[PDB]
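Ticket opened by: R.M.
Priority: normal
Category: complex prediction / small molecule

The reporter submitted a protein together with 60G and asked that the result be attached to this ticket for the collaborator who will pick it up next week. Submitted input follows.
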Amino acid sequence: KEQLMDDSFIGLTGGEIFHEMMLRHKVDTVFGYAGGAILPVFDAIYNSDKFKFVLPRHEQGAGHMAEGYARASGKPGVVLVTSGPGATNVITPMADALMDGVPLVVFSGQVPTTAIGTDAFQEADIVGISRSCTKWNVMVKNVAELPRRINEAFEIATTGRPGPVLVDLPKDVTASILRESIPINTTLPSVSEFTSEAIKRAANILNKAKKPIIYAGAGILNNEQGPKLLKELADKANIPVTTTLQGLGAFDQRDPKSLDMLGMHGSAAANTAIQNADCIIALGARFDDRVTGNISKFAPEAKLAASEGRGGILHFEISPKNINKVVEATEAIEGDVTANLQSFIPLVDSIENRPEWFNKINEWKKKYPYSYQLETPGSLIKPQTLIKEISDQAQTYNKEVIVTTGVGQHQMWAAQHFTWTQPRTMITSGGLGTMGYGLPAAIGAQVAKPDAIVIDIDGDASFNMTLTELSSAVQAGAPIKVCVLNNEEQGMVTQWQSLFYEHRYSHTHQSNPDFMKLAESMNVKGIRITNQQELKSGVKEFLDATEPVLLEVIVEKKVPVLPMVPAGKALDDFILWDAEVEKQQNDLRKERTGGKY
Amino acid sequence: KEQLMDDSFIGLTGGEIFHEMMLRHKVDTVFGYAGGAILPVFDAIYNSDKFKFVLPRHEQGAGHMAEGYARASGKPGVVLVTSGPGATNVITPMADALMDGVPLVVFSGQVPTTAIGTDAFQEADIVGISRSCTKWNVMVKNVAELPRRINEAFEIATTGRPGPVLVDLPKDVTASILRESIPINTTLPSVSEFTSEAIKRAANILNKAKKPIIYAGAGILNNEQGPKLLKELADKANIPVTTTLQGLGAFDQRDPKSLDMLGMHGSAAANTAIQNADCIIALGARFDDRVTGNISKFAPEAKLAASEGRGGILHFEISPKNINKVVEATEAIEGDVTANLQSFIPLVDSIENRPEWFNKINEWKKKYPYSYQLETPGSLIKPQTLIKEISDQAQTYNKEVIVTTGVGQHQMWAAQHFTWTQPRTMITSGGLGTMGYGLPAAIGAQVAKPDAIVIDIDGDASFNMTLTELSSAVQAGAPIKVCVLNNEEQGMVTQWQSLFYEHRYSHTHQSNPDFMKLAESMNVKGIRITNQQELKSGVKEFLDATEPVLLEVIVEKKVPVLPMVPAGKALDDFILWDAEVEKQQNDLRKERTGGKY
Amino acid sequence: FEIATTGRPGPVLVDLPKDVTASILRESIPINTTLPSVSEFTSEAIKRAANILNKAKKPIIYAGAGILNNEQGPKLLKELADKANIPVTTTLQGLGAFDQRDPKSLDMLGMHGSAAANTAIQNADCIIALGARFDDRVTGNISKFAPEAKLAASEGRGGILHFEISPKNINKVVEATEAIEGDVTANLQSFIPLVDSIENRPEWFNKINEWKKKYPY
Ligand SMILES: Cc1cc2nc3c(=O)[nH]c(=O)nc-3n(C[C@H](O)[C@H](O)[C@H](O)COP(=O)(O)OP(=O)(O)OC[C@H]3O[C@@H](n4cnc5c(N)ncnc54)[C@H](O)[C@@H]3O)c2cc1C
Ligand SMILES: Cc1cc2nc3c(=O)[nH]c(=O)nc-3n(C[C@H](O)[C@H](O)[C@H](O)COP(=O)(O)OP(=O)(O)OC[C@H]3O[C@@H](n4cnc5c(N)ncnc54)[C@H](O)[C@@H]3O)c2cc1C
Ligand SMILES: Cc1cc2nc3c(=O)[nH]c(=O)nc-3n(C[C@H](O)[C@H](O)[C@H](O)COP(=O)(O)OP(=O)(O)OC[C@H]3O[C@@H](n4cnc5c(N)ncnc54)[C@H](O)[C@@H]3O)c2cc1C
Ligand SMILES: COC(=O)c1ccccc1CS(=O)(=O)NC(=O)Nc1nc(OC)cc(OC)n1
Ligand SMILES: COC(=O)c1ccccc1CS(=O)(=O)NC(=O)Nc1nc(OC)cc(OC)n1
Ligand SMILES: C/C(NCc1cnc(C)nc1N)=C(/S)CCOP(=O)([O-])OP(=O)([O-])O
Ligand SMILES: C/C(NCc1cnc(C)nc1N)=C(/S)CCOP(=O)([O-])OP(=O)([O-])O
Ligand SMILES: [K+]
Ligand SMILES: [K+]
Ligand SMILES: [Mg+2]
Ligand SMILES: [Mg+2]
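Result attached by the on-call engineer:
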């Protein structure tokens, strides 16, 4: 009994217990912001040398920083904020983390238990508000249960599909002192025959396939061996590989078997290949509606193969909720994709050549490059060209390169035109798609990986959302590299307004600050590229900098991201770039807007 | 039947119907930000000349702007945002509006009804998330019900205790076209014997009182005749008047009967008077826990009088939920306080003099001024002095003057040291207490009242939260006046850390940008006051400006807001300013921090 | 089981999916999960409560279901009533907590309670609420409830002493002059020794006995 109970926390405040549990969970970084209700915890962590504390300018900043940290490091991102508005300000980052499967542990101060439900000063019902944007949450009601709840939070955040959790900390609980012993288990952190048979059946199906394709996503990144086993499978059975936006970097795009990204703005070669494949191996991807195109018209050849007993969809998925949610799996392989790949690959036959399939694959790649209208004499820099320049120069350094983005056209062009080669190097808001993510995510990733080059490829409207966090990067010592693609428009929305609303640009042009004076005011280096002849040397200065730096690039306006699978269309029913079409579109836009755009 | 149905909307899209209903509800301003799911509504309002559209840099900005607009104008603040993160970004302003009783009508785009519940692109469960921070919300499910739901929203937002509502607008609903007639009532906007007897009993109680006091709050501001009837009552029955933070401006503070603000940081004269009053007339105030002090020790003399049948608490309250919630009312007068005052006052006896009560009142006012340590040769400007300077110079213009604030010490000093004389001139986050409120609220108030001087008295940490909205003020043509009290600290938190945590300043010093370069980058005039000899002329330049302007003032650091009723103490158990005590505290802080603070 | 039986006891539900109850445990589990299981603040409140009762000239015990939740509850209730010479009324749910045959029994109070019990609580200067929640079948019109105890509280010579285990039910309906948080039986063990022994209350019990005589059922 004495062996099962622990007295070592007796005499500590809840805040002190919190501090000790952070250490036991190997937390090396906390992102947060103080306030009245969370003071007992801030007093306990005062001058701690046990972890780095990162102070944002806004709690949304703390949230997205913790996300960037978690995606760069594979560890949970820990957030510590006060009650009321400190807590409600973390709602967008929590919903973001939930949609993108990001392990976030949010600790929010709360008014004393005696004031809850009285419309108290700085009281929000954050447990109610965050229910739908967390995997789980709880309000701690006494200090004796605080260690158990902290263990529970970290365990839930990091198991199954990773995601956000919230633990609410009333001020009287964190100020109270533990007076009683607690179970010692609470003071420390931590293949079915059914699945084994599904794996065997899956292998037998793949061994019949004549047109296989791997559709790989974020889940493969959640194990360090993931990308290795993906390559091992693709190499053994000779299978072309496409990834989602969130799977970018899971497979070496330089490899001949790389089909690049699929989906709404993915390669027409990848989209064509998945529409014609007789066997689809879905590895840690959830068939999102930006990827599938028209669901009823998705993967016709794999559905036919399944019906004829010679292919189908093999779905390696850790969360049962996402199995058979969108598309019917021919075989569902439940659990960690990397673990299940270790069992799968040895049952898979080695294949030397697939001459007709790869003849088709190579023909599609050749006819469907990411084409766009190149610069002409006197024109502005094209945003596609800028991305290529950054990608080509960044790979010259002897350092890891991590990219974060905002949301919009710049995000899609970054996805398309960067060459992705390493896991956890694309850190982008995909499911919720939060403008403003890019800068704080970069700071969080830079803190996780202090020897990495971290580049925030950002849109001007996105950057405007959270640009106050530039001060935070300086104060944290995070030498991030922000590149603002300044088209002076919410380009992704003007793209839709051009295509579907006859060039009626309804409130999609926000005015920008002077980004060079802004950088100066924030004590950040500033570079501005305004013409084609400054692109190369300006990008070099940007990447050579050893301090935080903001690069502004003036780029062409009103240019669409192509290819594009419009809403309602099948994945292989895409719009492609055409020079003459673009020219006509420009003329039509000019006429319709009286020359304003 | 034809007389009761209406066909006039047949053939319009949901977006077009939205637009027409804004007009029918006399909306003259919409605050919002575009995105994919709300495009059909943005297309319908394209180039509308029916209202002004205000574009922020962040949807939180739109939310707080709409709040500032509503509090300045008495009209609901209308917000229009997209799905997913556009919607979750309005959660803090909704919780803010709920706590402070602000009529907000939030319209959020949503993914098509066919995608709801599928973890769709940019899908949040905003109806679930916002349930607890709205009076009411709804998801519109077909276009035929869109006019009814819009009417419902405006009606709920503006009746009872005003507050926020949310209406969720799926993209397929707002793109769909009305094909059927709808009830014509849905296409147009819009004293019990029990209460009458309570009013009579209330008058009889007041007519017995020998030490009455009026405790007036935000509710009195919700009717244009409110302040007039408050004055009429105070004048007739010869009653001293104290207000909450949110009631500031309900009563002319220049009047001899003014006791100023009560509460945690209110006047010790007001706090003493309410602790000794035999009759408390609570007019549109909710007995918040920043006001009452220790509840069991609150208003002892009024409780005694009630028990002896010669006084008590007379609570004029519109929301039954807030009657007898905190303190027992001797008489509850349910409904609009202004309407019920019209019945009340004629039953109230006219009183010429109250010599002993006003002898006490005048003695308390004399001994309890808002004292503080004045400037000395070479010292920094004191923040209390700055506020007095602004208040004195602002009243020289022939214009209305509206003040918004951030949250913290600067907010309390603004409340204490301004002289409040007019209704709806103090626009401040009180119940939720949201840092970052000040700048966007000012923009919203300036749009509501374009001929007013609007001054955001802001803290440096608060201002950092949302400073990107400076661009928004320029783009909106709102010549707001921002005064940043730069103490380089989260002063309200360092005040608590000094007093209760032995000068352990745990993460309460955020680094600031260069505010003058920041202003320049945002195309805003900048003024910096760094010493005592620049205060007068700098404040004059600030107020004389006819364009948006940011004033930075360097002020004394580590100075507490006094008086202060510490948590747990009775309202009349306050800390007062003492020169020697302040000196000792400075010496102790210097010793404990090794001279750092 | 722990939640059901601690604090204010109440119902809990555990939902058991068929595939979980048919599945077989394949992994070890923490051994703690395979086995079942006075603050200075409250101590000071108890002392203040005793000082208030020691001033009372018209005390009454209002006892409810909470006193039944400890086997020693009724014993300590009797010990208190006997020591300080206090009449006892109970709720419907407290029936049987006190021997109704005892001369100090006022019977049940409330909507259909004895008019003697109802009269006594309306005239008492000190009300000792033991494990009872001031339900709306018991209090009658809340604003008119316990006028003499409210007056005594304001004059610093009585009031309501509420022994309650669930903070949610403290100051929910009526303001407690002293709130004594936790198990009523445990807190009575501390309380009674601080309470002065009283031999007679001639005028109060003269009123009590007159009310019982004129208000039978
Ligand atoms: C403007 C914009 C345009 C976009 N267009 C595209 C586009 O064209 N193409 C595109 O791909 N995306 C696009 N997106 C992003 C898209 O919305 C989704 O975010 C993304 O496709 C999801 O990719 P994913 O399935 O790999 O990742 P996730 O959403 O994180 O899903 C991962 C899946 O793997 C599972 N999983 C997690 N861990 C494991 C494990 N250890 N083992 C097994 N399974 C696991 C998860 O439970 C989940 O089901 C766009 C986003 C924006 C903002
Ligand atoms: C750092 C900080 C310190 C603070 N310290 C203080 C302080 O010292 N003193 C202080 O006063 N505040 C202080 N506050 C603010 C405090 O938290 C509350 O916000 C404020 O006191 C509420 O004032 P109120 O009751 O008048 O307004 P509200 O909270 O809006 O309540 C108004 C009440 O009137 C009712 N009502 C509304 N309309 C009508 C109507 N037409 N007729 C009748 N009734 C109506 C409402 O239903 C409600 O019950 C502080 C805030 C901060 C951030
Ligand atoms: C037709 C009808 C008529 C009724 N009329 C009457 C009437 O006239 N008179 C009457 O009395 N009732 C009447 N009732 C019943 C009434 O509605 C309530 O059910 C009852 O009065 C509650 O009694 P109680 O407070 O003792 O019990 P409970 O409702 O169980 O409350 C017990 C309280 O003690 C607390 N408590 C529990 N355990 C402990 C502990 N260990 N230590 C300290 N505190 C503890 C609880 O948290 C709770 O606050 C009537 C019911 C019906 C159906
Ligand atoms: C955050 O509010 C609470 O924690 C709270 C709410 C309701 C009831 C009781 C409390 C605890 S408290 O009264 O002691 N206030 C407190 O802890 N912090 C506190 N901090 C300030 O700035 C740091 C300013 C301030 O009131 C202006 N209150
Ligand atoms: C906002 O998402 C939706 O409205 C949605 C979500 C799930 C299923 C269907 C829809 C409607 S949609 O597929 O037609 N997309 C849409 O309306 N807007 C849209 N806007 C973009 O930028 C303006 C970019 C973009 O995908 C990258 N989608
Ligand atoms: C308004 C909007 N989307 C809706 C929206 C609104 N609000 C938020 C917080 N997030 C999103 N995604 C976009 S993508 C425009 C982004 O503009 P940008 O940051 O300048 O990027 P770009 O011009 O490259 O498309
Ligand atoms: C951190 C904090 N309060 C907790 C907090 C945290 N986060 C938010 C969004 N709001 C609040 N109210 C305060 S009041 C400090 C404010 O500092 P300031 O804006 O520089 O003002 P001042 O120094 O005058 O007190
Ligand atoms: K690429
Ligand atoms: K004043
Ligand atoms: Mg842009
Ligand atoms: Mg400050």
